[PDB]
């Protein structure tokens, strides 16, 4: 069918949740991690400006290139059926998504800086608007119709979120202990509902037949 | 439903929601706050930042959406403005997205001294925003169609209005004999769409 190529520098980076979509929802893909070295000689093929980029080979004629990350991320979820299956879950799918966007923002704040200025940054914003918009994060939790961020299914939304919370807990390991409750719960029910997920997200290598 | 849109700024972040709504020739009542009377008021919107839209049905109840872009697209899912096919709907993300990173340098802009926003203008300006702009201009190159996304009205077209609308805030002669694309599909748009060309140059009424 189609070749799917996720070109990305970090993992965990602005592909994640393109990544995870592709992962909850059983589509084959081919990972195309970037180092730092090996970017000179890969950068005048892809798309070729900047990543993340996905390289879609299927139609036929021709191969789709693909930029803008979470663009790229509600396409893929979208086709498998995970932006909501009404209007109505689509625009609670499409809120999470903004507010984890919201918290992403605070995230990216700390990004290419050195230490110091690093940790004065991270001070910041964890005594700032990181608490507010996690509050706002659990209330939308809160407010689901269901186990996950919008009902039961897997969307967008819960990909995201594990992604933005990802990196909060990466500037402070504890920001989250005894704290948040509905943030801790949605990632036990998100791993618990989406078996591809639980496997993916815990590198767990030997799965039972 | 009654639709009212709740907000500080009609050129703020509600924008998209406010074009969305005109675009789709969808009727809505406008709540401005003005900074006076904030304090009154807040209170009374859950819980307790705008923008903010209050839906009620014919029987009053009332629900509540926040999150403008999360808003704009359910606006524009609803009356077929977020692309006509998975693709479309990707080429309308992108644009949304694009024209979001440029939003980014606008908002450095915001809540400063006239000292150092002039600064921040005068940087962004000659960082980023260039770049960001070519980006918006080859995308729209890249348009099937004389609008953003193909032929037909999307959000994209709307937050392309509201983004560029801010960037010209910034500097009004930023565009003036460059970005043809931008300017362009502008024109293209307000052609395209009387709802939107009537709202937008503030034209009319009638009563009638």
């Given at each position: 069918?189609?070749?799917?190529?996720?070109?990305?520098?970090?993992?965990?980076?602005?592909?994640?949740?393109?990544?995870?979509?592709?992962?909850?929802?059983?589509?084959?893909?081919?990972?195309?991690?970037?180092?730092?070295?090996?970017?000179?000689?890969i950068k005048p093929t892809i798309?070729?400006?900047?990543?993340?980029?996905?390289?879609?080979?299927?139609?036929?004629?021709?191969?789709?290139?693909?930029?803008?990350?979470?663009?790229?991320?509600?396409?893929?979820?979208?086709?498998?059926?995970?932006?909501?299956?009404?209007?109505?879950?689509?625009?609670?799918?499409?809120?999470?998504?903004?507010?984890?966007?919201?918290?992403?923002?605070?995230?990216?704040?700390?990004?290419?800086?050195?230490?110091?200025?690093?940790?004065?940054?991270?001070?910041?914003?964890?005594?700032?608007?990181?608490?507010?918009?996690?509050?706002?994060?659990?209330?939308?939790?809160?407010?689901?119709?269901?186990?996950?961020?919008?009902?039961?299914?897997?969307?967008?939304?819960?990909?995201?979120?594990?992604?933005?919370?990802?990196?909060?807990?990466?500037?402070?390991?504890?920001?989250?202990?005894?704290?948040?409750?509905?943030?801790?719960?949605?990632?036990?029910?998100?791993?618990?509902?989406?078996?591809?997920?639980?496997?993916?997200?815990?590198?767990?290598?030997?799965?039972?037949?």
């Amino acid at each position: 069918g189609d070749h799917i190529k996720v070109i990305y520098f970090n993992g965990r980076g602005r592909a994640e949740s393109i990544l995870m979509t592709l992962v909850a929802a059983g589509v084959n893909y081919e990972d195309e991690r970037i180092s730092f070295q090996d970017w000179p000689k890969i950068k005048p093929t892809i798309p070729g400006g900047r990543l993340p980029a996905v390289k879609i080979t299927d139609n036929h004629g021709h191969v789709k290139w693909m930029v803008e990350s979470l663009a790229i991320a509600r396409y893929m979820a979208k086709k498998h059926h995970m932006m909501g299956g009404t209007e109505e879950e689509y625009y609670n799918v499409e809120k999470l998504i903004g507010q984890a966007e919201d918290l992403e923002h605070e995230y990216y704040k700390t990004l290419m800086k050195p230490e110091e200025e690093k940790q004065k940054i991270i001070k910041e914003i964890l005594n700032g608007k990181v608490p507010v918009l996690l509050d706002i994060i659990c209330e939308s939790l809160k407010a689901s119709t269901g186990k996950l961020a919008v009902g039961d299914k897997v969307t967008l939304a819960d990909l995201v979120l594990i992604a933005v919370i990802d990196h909060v807990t990466d500037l402070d390991k504890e920001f989250l202990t005894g704290k948040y409750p509905e943030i801790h719960k949605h990632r036990e029910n998100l791993l618990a509902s989406s078996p591809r997920l639980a496997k993916y997200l815990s590198d767990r290598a030997a799965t039972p037949f």
